[PDB]
TrEMBL record, chain A:
Protein source organism: Agrobacterium phage 7-7-1
Compartment(s) of residence: Virion
Protein origin, superkingdom: Viruses
Protein name: Major capsid protein
Location of this fragment in the whole protein: 210 to 261 of 469
From TrEMBL, chain B:
Name the record gives this protein: Structural protein
Organism per entry: Agrobacterium phage 7-7-1
Organism domain of life: Viruses
């Protein structure tokens, strides 16, 4: 999870205004990743490997 | 012997029948208008309320006029177009005075002028009163 933003809600307003305003909400996001593969190979000869 | 009140409650001219003078309310935290008529009218005369904003070139010169928005109360209704206005009725007499104000400040300057210029509009005098310095 990544919390991209928080946004702003409140504001300074007059006392006469009995209502209130709507702000801008935050913004949350989802992310993901992967893994990778490392591979190799090597070969021998039995007689040489035994005699060396 | 002196009981001077001009130090605590100054007054300024806002309309005199020929010209409208922007008034400054930045240094004060309350204010109100005052209407008086000097001769019999022919019909109601409506006024438009404006506020100005600090100019970009100079920090102490009023900008262009901006109309003041309305503010409805709890048990009440809004203006036809959402703006604020005051209308002086024809029943008023030469020996009376009327008072009124707006619920909110908006810009640091304020002004008032008639909707139209005519013979009737020249019979009304408007003045602005402050109620305390904060600086």
């Amino acid at each position: 999870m990544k919390i991209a933003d928080y946004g702003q809600l409140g504001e300074y307003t007059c006392d006469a205004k009995c209502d209130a305003e709507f702000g801008e909400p935050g913004n949350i996001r989802h992310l993901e990743g992967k893994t990778y593969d490392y591979r190799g190979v090597f070969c021998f000869n039995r007689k040489n490997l035994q005699e060396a | 012997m002196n009981f001077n009140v001009g130090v605590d409650f100054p007054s300024f001219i806002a309309w005199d029948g020929t010209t409208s003078f922007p008034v400054k309310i930045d240094g004060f935290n309350q204010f109100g208008f005052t209407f008086k008529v000097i001769e019999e009218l022919t019909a109601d005369v409506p006024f438009n309320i404006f506020y100005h904003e600090a100019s970009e070139a100079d920090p102490c010169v009023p900008g262009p006029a901006i109309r003041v928005p309305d503010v409805p109360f709890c048990d009440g209704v809004a203006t036809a177009d959402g703006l604020a206005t005051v209308v002086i009725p024809e029943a008023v007499a030469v020996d009376s005075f009327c008072a009124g104000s707006v619920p909110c400040f908006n810009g640091p300057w304020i002004s008032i002028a008639p909707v139209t210029v005519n013979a009737d509009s020249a019979k009304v005098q408007v003045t602005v009163t402050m109620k305390g310095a904060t600086r």
